[PDB]
Design a protein around this ligand. Structure first.
Ligand SMILES: NC(=O)C1=CN([C@@H]2O[C@H](COP(=O)(O)OP(=O)(O)OC[C@H]3O[C@@H](n4cnc5c(N)ncnc54)[C@H](O)[C@@H]3O)[C@@H](O)[C@H]2O)C=CC1
Ligand SMILES: NC(=O)C1=CN([C@@H]2O[C@H](COP(=O)(O)OP(=O)(O)OC[C@H]3O[C@@H](n4cnc5c(N)ncnc54)[C@H](O)[C@@H]3O)[C@@H](O)[C@H]2O)C=CC1
Ligand SMILES: NC(=O)C1=CN([C@@H]2O[C@H](COP(=O)(O)OP(=O)(O)OC[C@H]3O[C@@H](n4cnc5c(N)ncnc54)[C@H](O)[C@@H]3O)[C@@H](O)[C@H]2O)C=CC1
Ligand SMILES: NC(=O)C1=CN([C@@H]2O[C@H](COP(=O)(O)OP(=O)(O)OC[C@H]3O[C@@H](n4cnc5c(N)ncnc54)[C@H](O)[C@@H]3O)[C@@H](O)[C@H]2O)C=CC1
Ligand SMILES: NC(=O)C1=CN([C@@H]2O[C@H](COP(=O)(O)OP(=O)(O)OC[C@H]3O[C@@H](n4cnc5c(N)ncnc54)[C@H](O)[C@@H]3O)[C@@H](O)[C@H]2O)C=CC1
Ligand SMILES: NC(=O)C1=CN([C@@H]2O[C@H](COP(=O)(O)OP(=O)(O)OC[C@H]3O[C@@H](n4cnc5c(N)ncnc54)[C@H](O)[C@@H]3O)[C@@H](O)[C@H]2O)C=CC1
Ligand SMILES: Nc1nc2c(ncn2[C@@H]2O[C@H](COP(=O)(O)OP(=O)(O)OP(=O)(O)O)[C@@H](O)[C@H]2O)c(=O)[nH]1
Ligand SMILES: Nc1nc2c(ncn2[C@@H]2O[C@H](COP(=O)(O)OP(=O)(O)OP(=O)(O)O)[C@@H](O)[C@H]2O)c(=O)[nH]1
Ligand SMILES: Nc1nc2c(ncn2[C@@H]2O[C@H](COP(=O)(O)OP(=O)(O)OP(=O)(O)O)[C@@H](O)[C@H]2O)c(=O)[nH]1
Ligand SMILES: N[C@@H](CCC(=O)O)C(=O)O
Ligand SMILES: N[C@@H](CCC(=O)O)C(=O)O
Ligand SMILES: N[C@@H](CCC(=O)O)C(=O)O
Lengths: 501, 501, 501
């Protein structure tokens, strides 16, 4: 998208890592309380850091499918497993003609660090199939997905205990259903956990409430934790809260649409929505329900009645918050000086080059990094995986017990008070509030997903802020996130003896 | 038992399914939001329904055992796995000379729909060994059970992740213990979940509190949910409640005895008990403890001192509630007109022919169907399976923490009140009621089984009633149950792409 | 095909077995060198024989396929494994709407006894899929075959070490190629012997020279061994040899066509060819090349220019040798009195009922039984299986060495003679005959198949003749074959301890 500043994607992520490694290297050496206090301490710390960076296993595939017209075609595919310091590996499947070994390796490493940031016990992985799904029938896409699943399974690149895929660009519920069905019907036929081989499944198939919207929901929570922190909003020259703010959204897919829904719900105003074919704009606000309904009907956002076909880059629209939610390397050395927003919330994976990060720093623009902000997807995938391993819906064993227990608890307060203020205090009814009445039976699956996600995004934001203050990083939240990720992954490699050697 | 009306058991169940299918076919088509809205929608729906009905896998066995006298004998066995839209498969093992491929296939399909009715995530299965256990020593029954287990295991028809058996007619705790022991000692020696290969185990071997009586306990809860619904008792010309009612029980086994115990406990009167050799009768009431104690002593029901040997069919005894709890196809065209009970509670599997269902409908007789009413067995088997997968007894990690937490909670109310009503109010002791003092530590295994079962039977009864109302089915509860079952199973097949094809 | 005499196929084969059992029971008892010479001996022999008759494992399947027009259809399938006294099991796959559990069990048991007759170390098995293949496109038949393979593999009913299928009615090279490809590409991906999971493969995929024509070639060898034995030809009143004889063939498939080719090659005259739509007749002879070429061109036998459309049963055509090579139970008590032929060579499996056998005995008609006569198919399948296990083509390692060795051997005779008869004898060239020059390099795959088959059919014929004289069975060759089969299978069960009970 830019021939001036177009770094190799894997190496760009390695650069981000190098930078966080630079900052913590002292802390790692000093923690290390080995008798070698000689600066082979320094040496073993940077030997371990070199082990963490490259992907351990990458599988490249070519397999034939026969198209609906009868033609034979060769499909190309890839899956990278970056780290196995936690198992299984976790990461999505991308259907796109931009798929390549380097793109997949880069996203696989992002998954490792992202999972470490939100304390999700998975190593990183990613897959890609180099096709444009719009050029294939549904029957052909099913054939490609099912065959890809078996080629991965034959070589140990999918399974509930090694590698658990998930949706990404141009895949969703539908593909995940296909993956889970052919895994469970063949190699997983005797495995009690066969349907935990993949997440993002439909509900009828072991999916979890809110997985489709989960990463949008997490984008809201990530922004909210920082947009409500007066210390960061001072440096930006902006007022805490959502009620008065504007935002623009690049990409109207699963991440972009649901980020818009939740931000709109809490008083922000969507001004611009950009897509693969063009952009639309309205300074008075775009309604997400109307835009979705139009998009579902016409297969495009152009021509939306209540906004005007906007020319020029969606990334340079004037707004408070820019949400790049499409592909990677969209903000570069070129357009970074014209961005006009004061908060960049990366919903997409790797939308900002390192050169663009430098410009944004100089310019007091806050980039909330992908490592943290889009990790709501993998957090709720983690909940889905646990739901599959546990083989019950949350609360089903305890709803009645817990309901009865709570009423007897409140009755214990009632009877204790009547016992004391006897006859002429009268009857002293203790009853639930409206809000407690609605929790009287304990959490359900929906409650766990919402509160578990909010808990994770908040706990992770505080850890990033703590680390940024400690090292005087200002608005370089990306380096603070990598610092936390590196510290966690380093400790695992260090206390494990590294490897089987 | 009746030459007039003796339909093929598997097809009889298919008939029940066809009825429910015909009622919901419209709702399925409408619901289906696909691009080809012709009756090619109606074609896809009927094609899926044809896939659901037949059993996917049936295994037939012949194996030799050498009897205690030294002779060789050939034993015949069968296990059917009806559906794998949920895994594992679940279903009991029947030892009987009436066992056949068709009987086993019929019961396997009943397990699928039954599990869907109570939201238990298992596909249906069933097994049968064609012997009369009364003609074999305990030593021979152990050798038959252990060998049957190995022949099933070799071909993938038992295992914690494919197929989990359970007791049925003429098997119980003892056979399940044998099954679990030879599975875990051979093929399952390395499997962390080996003891979840079968349910209905003794407590000492991974069984769960109340499994033996669970299906009787569920029969009580199923009746109660309908006997307390004035709308249904109006149509019957009856008074809500148990305190004034009579019932008769065909079959004094695991289902019959415990149904009697719980109904007797809540004020119903047992008037008649029928059994393979004869019946007994007493309009003043039969007490279940005395009857069981007699039966344990003498091996039969007849000659019970405190009732008289009744001649003529147990099914035509005069009572309010008839509980067939023996074999299948007991109520037919023939004796349906002479039933003289107003509620038929099927504890057994398939005790009523479709012709007998017609007659009962015309005479405003309520048949509470097997699909729903005897599903307490599989519900508590499900709890046992989860207990095995979790490897802790319920509450053991939390009893102390929870009890301490509750006392500090009540102290928080106490100190807050004293802090306000100073010593101008004295000491204000907040203490548990007797009821809450029992629950101060949280649920135990017994509590979860009792309240989890009650929760399931209630929630399922409400879904059946809501569906019968919505389609104007009156007292045809069987068709309402199948409607619920079909809708649930259809959605799974639909959103899975049907099969790897 | 005949209401009068249409016995249950499984029990008909059990009748044949009972009959041979009756004749050898004494010989088994006195061989038995145990010292409880009581009529315990008596009793264990009869107990073992009842263990041998029933099938040990039968799997019944239902699976959905989506047809080319888009509709869903449920396919029904069966595989029976009769005995595992030798492993793997061996038997063909039949595509036919007459397929049934009893048909498959019957053919599976025939495979056990057939394999014992020709000393092929396999237990018996058989499979059937209930479809008519001409009502399906090639694409549909491929999906049905591939899916059937996976359903069998999941449950242990196909594999190089348990069960090795092969072609039968309406399957051939094509289907076997599909079976081998999906087995080796999925469950067998790591198995060094994956391509020995099925026989009858095309040559390019591990097949062996002459498998398609093997069972026809064996029919010729079986007839020849008996048609050249003057003692049997006396009782028939006819002249040894082929040069003067006529035959008719019911069924022009893989067995029928190749039986015709080889008999025609050695001077017999084919008068009549019958098939599913009609028969053709010519007392001057039908040429198999021209008939096959016509059949390949028009898809039928009728209208063949050099014969006349014959009406009335092919089985009653007047000829010396009748070869039923279609389905089973074609000769019954009805048409047995009108057969006209002196020799009935059963190429097909079970074409003669026991009642028809009695009539043929009374009329001095020789029935060469299926157990022996069509076993050339399984014999060459056995060679194919061994070729797969050995992973070399026969002779490839030794052609050059053996060639060189033979020339040096002949040169040793030459030089020894010259040394002795010095110059007064000249040069004494020792060179191969034309026949030996063809064998100078040793056997190839083709040579082993031809001579290995001839060796097996001859050795088995003499064992049958020896046994028939021994017990004064005359022309009841079927009972002599079963006697040999039973003796061999009994010896294995006896010295194995029967089973692990
Ligand atoms: N799928 C998930 O759960 C998660 C996805 N992500 C990342 O979010 C990003 C996008 O989210 P997806 O779920 O893939 O959405 P999606 O694949 O459903 O839709 C992507 C949208 O972006 C549009 N698009 C593509 N290139 C564009 C361009 N140059 N300008 C404007 N629009 C463009 C497409 O037309 C489409 O509307 C990806 O980078 C993905 O890796 C991050 C976390 C979780
Ligand atoms: N084995 C499998 O293929 C699947 C297994 N599961 C397991 O079930 C556990 C619980 O999830 P749920 O409690 O189902 O969520 P849930 O109770 O919210 O169920 C959501 C949907 O599943 C339906 N459902 C329940 N039992 C069914 C049955 N026997 N047949 C068809 N549909 C049925 C419900 O009626 C509802 O429509 C999960 O932990 C997961 O491990 C879930 C889905 C598929
Ligand atoms: N075992 C379980 O948890 C469940 C059992 N069922 C069904 O309940 C029925 C029986 O319950 P079981 O557990 O098998 O109890 P059981 O097998 O321990 O006892 C059955 C009793 O019925 C008697 N009986 C047999 N044939 C009879 C006939 N023709 N008329 C009258 N009485 C007869 C027997 O003598 C025996 O006393 C079966 O249909 C079974 O499939 C259904 C759901 C759960
Ligand atoms: N691995 C196996 O073979 C068995 C495993 N279990 C597992 O244990 C889990 C929890 O069940 P429990 O804790 O047994 O229920 P529980 O704590 O209620 O105990 C049931 C009975 O087992 C006895 N018991 C406990 N530990 C024992 C030991 N080490 N040796 C002998 N007896 C002992 C207890 O005294 C009690 O009588 C279940 O999920 C089950 O799968 C249970 C029985 C056998
Ligand atoms: N294929 C093999 O290697 C062996 C086959 N067999 C048996 O030989 C018999 C047939 O040979 P296949 O290989 O099946 O050849 P095939 O199935 O390719 O041909 C069978 C022929 O018989 C004809 N046919 C079917 N029913 C008929 C009827 N009622 N009357 C006249 N013709 C009829 C068909 O039109 C076809 O021409 C079967 O019984 C099979 O079990 C026995 C040993 C080996
Ligand atoms: N693993 C597999 O899928 C297969 C394995 N084989 C193994 O080879 C053994 C002997 O059979 P062959 O030696 O093939 O019989 P063979 O030596 O008579 O050759 C049969 C044909 O295979 C061709 N062939 C040989 N090597 C080839 C290669 N690398 N790629 C493609 N075609 C090739 C030859 O040109 C020849 O036309 C079999 O018993 C089997 O173990 C044979 C066929 C398939
Ligand atoms: N695309 C889209 N998804 C929706 C819409 N409304 C609800 N959902 C999603 O459907 C799932 C179930 O929605 P609800 O039953 O309303 O429950 P919910 O979790 O409170 O919904 P939300 O708070 O909006 O996430 C959630 O993942 C929702 O985000 C919608 O209008 N459009
Ligand atoms: N056969 C038989 N079983 C009994 C009897 N009494 C209790 N049980 C069962 O034995 C188990 C132990 O009973 P309890 O210790 O009283 O526990 P419980 O769950 O309160 O028992 P119930 O309320 O009677 O179901 C439970 O499964 C009972 O259902 C009895 O008198 N005869
Ligand atoms: N269907 C059919 N098969 C043939 C014909 N001719 C040969 N075959 C078979 O095709 C294979 C190749 O034949 P050949 O190369 O001549 O080898 P062969 O061993 O001499 O074959 P035979 O003629 O049977 O002796 C062998 O299995 C033959 O049995 C034919 O005309 N029609
Ligand atoms: N593919 C998403 C989430 C992966 C998952 O849910 O496992 C990502 O890029 O983070
Ligand atoms: N066999 C019981 C259920 C067995 C089980 O608990 O799984 C029935 O017919 O439903
Ligand atoms: N299906 C053939 C042969 C099977 C095989 O080659 O194994 C038969 O009936 O004997």
């Amino acid at each position: 998208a830019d021939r001036e500043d177009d770094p190799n994607f894997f190496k760009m992520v390695e650069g981000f890592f190098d930078r966080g490694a630079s900052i913590v290297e002292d802390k790692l050496v000093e923690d290390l309380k080995t008798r070698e206090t000689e600066e082979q301490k320094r040496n073993r710390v940077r030997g371990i850091l070199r082990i963490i960076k490259p992907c351990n296993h990458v599988l490249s595939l070519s397999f034939p499918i026969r198209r609906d017209d009868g033609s034979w075609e060769v499909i190309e595919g890839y899956r990278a497993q970056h780290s196995q310091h936690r198992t299984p590996c976790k990461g999505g499947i991308r259907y796109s003609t931009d798929v390549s070994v380097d793109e997949v390796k880069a996203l696989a490493s992002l998954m490792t660090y992202k999972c470490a940031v939100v304390d999700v016990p998975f190593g990183g992985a990613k897959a890609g199939v180099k096709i444009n799904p719009k050029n294939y029938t549904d029957n052909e896409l099913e054939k490609i997905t099912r065959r890809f699943t078996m080629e991965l399974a034959k070589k140990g690149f999918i399974g509930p205990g090694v590698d658990v895929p998930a949706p990404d660009m141009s895949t969703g519920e539908r593909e995940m259903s296909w993956i889970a069905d052919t895994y469970a019907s063949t190699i997983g036929h005797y495995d009690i956990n066969a349907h935990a081989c993949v997440t993002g499944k439909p509900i009828s198939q072991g999916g979890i409430h809110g997985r489709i919207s989960a990463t949008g929901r997490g984008v809201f929570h990530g922004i909210e934790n920082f947009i409500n922190e007066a210390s960061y909003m001072s440096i930006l020259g902006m007022t805490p809260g959502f009620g008065d703010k504007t935002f623009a959204v690049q990409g109207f897919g699963n991440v972009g649409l649901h980020s818009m829904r939740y931000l709109h719900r809490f008083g922000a105003k969507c001004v611009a929505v950009g897509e693969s074919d063009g952009s639309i704009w309205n300074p008075d606000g775009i309604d997400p329900k109307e835009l979705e309904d139009f998009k579902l009907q016409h297969g495009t956002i152009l021509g939306f009645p209540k906004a005007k076909i906007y020319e020029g880059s969606i990334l340079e629209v004037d707004c408070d918050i820019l949400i790049p939610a499409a592909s990677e390397k969209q903000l570069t050395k070129s357009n970074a000086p014209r961005v006009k927003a004061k908060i960049i919330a990366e919903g997409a994976n790797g939308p900002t080059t390192p050169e663009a990060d430098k410009i944004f720093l100089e310019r007091n623009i806050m980039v909330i990094p992908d490592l943290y902000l889009n990790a709501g997807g993998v957090t709720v995938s983690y909940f889905e995986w646990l739901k599959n391993l546990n083989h019950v819906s949350y609360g089903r064993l305890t709803f009645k017990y817990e309901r009865d227990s709570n009423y007897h608890l409140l009755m214990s307060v009632q009877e204790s008070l009547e016992r004391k203020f006897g006859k002429h205090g009268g009857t002293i009814p203790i009853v639930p509030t409206a809000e407690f009445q609605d929790r009287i039976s304990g959490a359900s699956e929906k409650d766990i997903v919402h509160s578990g996600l909010a808990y994770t995004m908040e706990r992770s934001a505080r850890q990033i802020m703590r680390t940024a203050m400690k090292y005087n990083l200002g608005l370089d939240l990306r380096t603070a996130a990598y610092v936390n990720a590196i510290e966690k992954v380093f400790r695992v490699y260090n206390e494990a003896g590294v490897t089987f050697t």
